Design goal:
The structure is cut from a larger assembly and holds 2 copies of chain A, 1 copy of chain C, 1 copy of chain D, 1 copy of chain E and 1 copy of chain F. Chain C is mainly alpha-helical. Helix content of chain C is 69%, strand content 0%. By secondary structure, chain E is mainly β. Chain E has 1 helix and 25 strands. In chain E, the strands form 7 sheets. Chain E has a 4-stranded antiparallel β-sheet, with no helix packed on it. Chain E starts with 7 loop residues before the first strand and ends with a helix. Chain F is built from 3 helices and 5 strands. Chain F has a 5-stranded antiparallel β-sheet with strand order 2-1-5-4-3, with helices on both faces. Classes of the chains: A alpha+beta, C mainly alpha, D mainly alpha, E mainly beta, F alpha+beta. Chains in contact: A-B, A-D, A-E, A-F, B-C, B-D, B-E, C-E, D-E. The B-D interface holds B 71-72, 87-92, 125-128 and D 246-247, 249-251, 253-254, 257-258, 261-262. The PDB classes it as motor protein. The entry lists the keywords axoneme, outer dynein arm, post power stroke, dynein, motor protein. In situ outer dynein arm from Chlamydomonas reinhardtii in the post-power stroke state.
Amino acid sequence: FPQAVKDLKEGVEKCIYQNNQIDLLEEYFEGETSEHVVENLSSKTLMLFKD
Amino acid sequence: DQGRHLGPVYSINRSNQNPKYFLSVGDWSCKIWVEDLKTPIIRTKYHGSYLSDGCWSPTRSGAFFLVRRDGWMDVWDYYYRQNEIAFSHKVSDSPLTCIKINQTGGAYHNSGKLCAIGDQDGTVTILELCDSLYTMQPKEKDIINEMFEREYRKE
Amino acid sequence: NKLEKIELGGTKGKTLTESIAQIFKEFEEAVQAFTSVSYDIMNIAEKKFDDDFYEFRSKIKELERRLASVITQGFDDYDTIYGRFKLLDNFEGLLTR
Amino acid sequence: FIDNNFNRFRYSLKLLHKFQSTIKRHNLTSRYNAILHNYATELDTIQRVFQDQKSNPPLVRNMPPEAGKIIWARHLFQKITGPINIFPTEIRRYYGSYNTLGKQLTIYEMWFYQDWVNKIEQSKAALQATLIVRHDENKKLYVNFDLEIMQLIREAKCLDRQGIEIPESARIILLQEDKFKTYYNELLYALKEYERINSKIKPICKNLLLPHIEDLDLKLRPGMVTLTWTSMNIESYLYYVHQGLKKLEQLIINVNDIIENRIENNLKTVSKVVLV
Amino acid sequence: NPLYPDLFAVSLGSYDFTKQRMGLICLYSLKNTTHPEYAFNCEAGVMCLDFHPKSAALLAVGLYDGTVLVYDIRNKHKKPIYQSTVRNQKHTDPVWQVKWNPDTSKNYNFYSISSDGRVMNWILMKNKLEPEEVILLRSTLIGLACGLCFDFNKFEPHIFLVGTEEGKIHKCSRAYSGQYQETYNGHLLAVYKVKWNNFHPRTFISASADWTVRIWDSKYTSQIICFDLSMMVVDAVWAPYSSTVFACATMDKVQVYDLNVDKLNKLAEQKIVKQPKLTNLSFNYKDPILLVGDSHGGVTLVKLSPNLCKSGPEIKQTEDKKAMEEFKNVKIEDYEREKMENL
Amino acid sequence: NADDQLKQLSALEGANGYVIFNESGIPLKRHEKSISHEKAVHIAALVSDLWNVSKKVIQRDLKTPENDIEVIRLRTKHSYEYIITQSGDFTMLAIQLCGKAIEEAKKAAAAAAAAAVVQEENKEKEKK
């Protein structure tokens, strides 16, 4: 039992270091939308009334 | 003495949001006057031909619409740029005799969404304004009051 | 003192006034240095006051330089002869020679 | 201690300060020998650099090659002159530095003259050509501005900054350089604005509004092909183009509002009607 | 990007003037190095790319013909959020340096320096951009002086340093549009980059076309220290982690100098890529990693050694939290005093 | 000696707990932060079913001769990570978290410490 645990832990520790270097699942600017976005003012004739 | 218009005043209106400030559209350029000042607080540019009618937006105090006699309607918004017209639209070749903006509302139409302008020809056109123009922008009422009071103090 | 009282309220507002307010405060800060007037009292024999004047002269020029910039920005912003003229009347007595 | 100080100095500006303390007390001869030798080493590295930077000198960022190369050569000559003056054996190092400089001034003066003669003739032809031109394949209006005139204008400005005396003909263009930039910027803005107005017009209307689209070209065309770049009143012509675009925008905006609002809402409502 | 250390964006541009091609802006995430996280297509090569400190998404892009492009990373479409036109008074020639003003009180402020030489302040608006000229470069010469770079002191917003093609670095003040606070005539050639030293005020390092690197004091009218390199110097960048640390890349050689470690000799010299010349180099604030850009557009990041560090005479000595932002400021002053004694 | 490995596993950054399983399924040693024995009994049963199924599946389901799984890592929601490594007849489960998760844990610990300090201050006030 003694040898296996140091060895097993060592292997577990090696796995921990690789994942710790970079998150690898993060999504840059996740969720937040475009926010300010230029909008052109617009006019739409709905109807014309004439005699 | 200093506020006399070159041509007879045609339309006098006051913003629904603030009663104290009222704008009178006379000859080439409409002017805005405070309740206790004889002189106009702000004079806005000059316009082609003459402005038959100008009315404040009921929904937003900052922007007021003036319709020229050249058949072109230009919207003045003081929230973003005091110096230039927010946008200019040509309703018809015929001169625009008058402009009326709807108040309150029902169904799919909100306050200030529909504007009715009467041409010299006799056609009447209803224009649906952009949602951003009709909808109040953040802190518009606070910003317009501070600017108008500041202009009044300067005058 | 006249500059602090001025309320042009033309085109862009508040940010221009805040800059003007800082300039008025800047002048008051110079007065507090000169205003304290330790010794001095315009002695003809003392040359310490003259040195303070030169330092004060630079401060007035800095105040004047800022006024020229703000005044030029305001003139461009109005975009109308009537609007630009109104600004000149407000600063009519504020011209720094 | 003195020996250690000398090594540290071997920077030239810094050496003088150390010397001032030393001045109060063959140290003076050694200091002069080190200063004279230091100047000679600086001249040798510059001489190697001058040959290396001959064919392809590194010019100032956003600087024309003809003017940028001349400026780099002038700066190298100025640096050599400052160390030669500092140096004030010693005579032999000064002789070599003088030979290198003489080469820089003689070769570059001939070099500067050659660039201006070729550039000035090319610049005049580019400056005087219509107003704007449209590619046959592209079939779209484009600013007919020439990069060489802009390149000559940037290089011409650089000579004034270094104090070199430019030719009178080049100076005339430089005096009017500010006016040309504004005219060029307005024309580019109008073309970008023109495309935006075209994009606004919907496809159905395009054919119906085709005659109106031709009118902008129709009003613009005499100004486009008869202005000859330096017209007496070009800015006034630009004003006419702006008036034409505004008239076109007004009618186009009204048509879009009539189609995208009142007629579209009716058709959309009828589709969503159900009526059962 | 200020928000994420892993995301860094390099905007490809075309040098040499005579050859002009479209420039692609690529943001390379550290997680994937095979291809750029975000790809942007531009009509002309992008001379300068910058990220707003307050918001990572806002991006400032400078291209040929002085066009100013604002891009939002969040937008899926990837079209420019804002553009500069003749009606918006866009400057002529090429905008070599573009920066984002830290203050957000007046919306968003954009600072761009054109080849023609007109500092331009751009304020973000709704479907419109407003341009304000901060200063004019402006002598028996024809036309405005050409400026290749500009920088703003973090400690004082009003004082900003602008480099010039002429070769004279000019200290400038936002309050005085037509006046120059001070002028430095030390450089004999155009200065490619001028940057204020970190953790100290009135100090900066400038890289010029002439192959010399000079460190100046704002109070002084001449450079305190000058470094001579046979290969032409392309750019010099201060180290964010510790003061008196900078990197200069010249003709495929990158050199890092620490004033405390060596008075003149470069601490380390390396060639990351043998085949291509290095167009520019950048420094990462979060970790000791240096990004080097080759002539072919290849970008390689080199991690610096642990030998160079702040508070190195004694490890964990005096336990001063203040010393990280104060002792570094104090150390340059002590180093600066030594230079004055020598001269 | 054996005790030091458990301390070493805790020392590694991003490590929450370590669980060791015998061939029978008894949990030899588990971390104190994580539930001891009750969680170990529940974790050992799940890992044995997963490890045995995966070991059996690779040899027959993938039709690959002499192919044995060495390490299995399951990345789930939030910061959870569960690397599984088998040495001799003992297989263990390690739970590590991401940088953000670690920062959150540190913040929580700081908050707990602050709460304890506040409680101590309240007790002192009561005594006074």
